[PDB]
Structure 1
Amino acid sequence: SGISLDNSYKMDYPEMGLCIIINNKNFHKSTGMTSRSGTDVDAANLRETFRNLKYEVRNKNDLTREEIVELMRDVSKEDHSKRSSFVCVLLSHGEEGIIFGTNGPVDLKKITNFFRGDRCRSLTGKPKLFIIQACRGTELDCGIETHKIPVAADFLYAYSTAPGYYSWRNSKDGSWFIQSLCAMLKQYADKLEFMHILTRVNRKVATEFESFSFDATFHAKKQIPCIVSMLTKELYFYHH
């Protein structure tokens, strides 16, 4: 045949892959964590959005830290040989590097380590996407008026917010990040490379949202999401 290029991940395996959505709304009272109003809107939007991208979606609700770890372990031990990619969405309370089970925290590292190039061989060389709607701390953005590969390769973290910052969720509409992400995937997944879709998401969250609160501390605040890419190729959800 003629000249070939390999600048993009192979996304024409028989299956696009799994999309695991962990939707933590209700937390054990002893943790002192609030109910996450609006997160069901997020979970439903994600399910439909990734369904239409032809992902095998599994929704899980209100998982303990133990259940999250066993779920991730089990999923990483499935045979993904006929799958192009893997997607995990985490909707919960969080801190920097941490997501909450209903009864306490899980290190994100513990979750993502299961999918290392050396620990999940049927996903080696394939994009592994972690989409995280959770706080990464307590900072508020006041805004301004205008032969081997690394085991850590081929991960992408789409964080809802910058390191150290709160992340915003609307109880009626869903989280700023997830609602923007689904919108941009709906509009552009048949048109743009994934980093460029996520960049549109950054702009949408940055420009169209601002918090409203009776509490001065929490009023008129802004958010920028944070794309963290260890990918080695371009990612298009479609194929020729």
Structure 2
Amino acid sequence: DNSYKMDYPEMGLCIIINNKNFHKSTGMTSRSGTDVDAANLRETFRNLKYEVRNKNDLTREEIVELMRDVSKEDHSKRSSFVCVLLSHGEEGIIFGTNGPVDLKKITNFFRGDRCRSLTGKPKLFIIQACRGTELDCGIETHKIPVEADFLYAYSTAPGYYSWRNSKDGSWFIQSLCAMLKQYADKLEFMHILTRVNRKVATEFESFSFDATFHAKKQIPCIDSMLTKELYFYHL
């Protein structure tokens, strides 16, 4: 059993939280282009046969409540769980429309001992958010652990900004959807994400009238506590 069982009746839920407009208390910019991301993800995971639920502009209270409620559903007939977070962020932190919440508080509901119908099933958290404010200048070329079976697909390295394009969407979500579309019927998930890493690292470079933000680079970060290989196809 080197591969997760992915032939349950349902692939599972894909929760997309798309935070675009932020309250003035938190003081934050609108995240132009994130609607492109949310739509790309909806279509991408629809074609992978996930039950997609799009949510927009949730407060941090609403994020925690949504995650609590979803973790209390019966996932028995579901192979996996996916949550995509599109928002501003800091290291370990995602922003509701009205302020920060620790990622650990969101993901804890899905721990092996707290969401029993997902125990032993892959729980994927895909995070398009800053992890800090560094820029990458680039260079010219039998129990199981309660924390097991999580994958965090971070858009950027710890400590760094994550780049978004107001017309095309974020670099990471653009590349993620493109690689899932091309390779989900061929490659194991870590190899898909490695191609995402390559695509973001090599094909994207910032263009800015402000020299301090110009010609910058990005590498995503795959954080796997999975115990098996993950294939989105069957047979």
The TM-score normalised by the length of structure 1 is 0.98
Alignment of 1:116-195 (within 5 A): 116-195=111-190
How big is the shift at 1:191? Answer: 0.2
Q: For 1:73 and 1:31, how far apart are their aligned partners in 2?
A: 23
SS in 1 for 2:156: coil
**CA deviation vs aligned residue, 1:45-65 (integer Å, no higher than 9, x gap):** 000000000000000000000
SS in 2 for 1:144: coil
Q: For 2:32 and 2:7, how far apart are their aligned partners in 1?
A: 37
Query: Which of 193, 197, 204 does residue 199 from structure 2 map onto?
Result: 204
**CA deviation vs aligned residue, 1:132-170 (integer Å, no higher than 9, x gap):** 000000010000001100000000000000000000000
Alignment of 1:2-81 (within 5 A): 6-81=1-76
Deviates more, 1:114-123 or 1:211-220: 211-220
**CA deviation vs aligned residue, 1:199-235 (integer Å, no higher than 9, x gap):** 0000000000000111111111000000000000000
How big is the shift at 1:29? Answer: 1.4
How big is the shift at 1:195? Answer: 0.1
Q: For 1:231 and 1:238, how far apart are their aligned partners in 2?
A: 18
**CA deviation vs aligned residue, 1:15-73 (integer Å, no higher than 9, x gap):** 00000000000000121100000000000000000000000000000000000000000
Q: Which runs of 4+ in 1 moved over 2 A?
A: none
Q: For 1:116 and 1:30, how far apart are their aligned partners in 2?
A: 32
> Across the two proteins, how many residue pairs are aligned to each other?
235
SS in 2 for 1:73: helix
SS in 2 for 1:181: helix
Q: For 2:3 and 2:233, how far apart are their aligned partners in 1?
A: 11
Percent identity, aligned pairs only? 99
Q: For 2:27 and 2:146, how far apart are their aligned partners in 1?
A: 37
SS in 1 for 2:212: helix
SS in 1 for 2:133: strand
How big is the shift at 1:100? Answer: 0.2
Q: For 1:21 and 1:216, how far apart are their aligned partners in 2?
A: 34
1:108 pairs with 2:103: yes
**CA deviation vs aligned residue, 1:177-212 (integer Å, no higher than 9, x gap):** 000000000000000000000000000000000001
Q: For 2:183 and 2:208, how far apart are their aligned partners in 1?
A: 33
**CA deviation vs aligned residue, 1:67-117 (integer Å, no higher than 9, x gap):** 000000000000000000000000000000000000000100000000000
Matched residue, 2:83: 88
Q: For 1:150 and 1:36, how far apart are their aligned partners in 2?
A: 37
The TM-score normalised by the length of structure 2 is 1.00
How big is the shift at 1:7? Answer: 0.4
Q: For 1:195 and 1:95, how far apart are their aligned partners in 2?
A: 24
- Where do 5+ consecutive residues of structure 2 fail to align? none
Deviates more, 1:29-38 or 1:77-86: 29-38
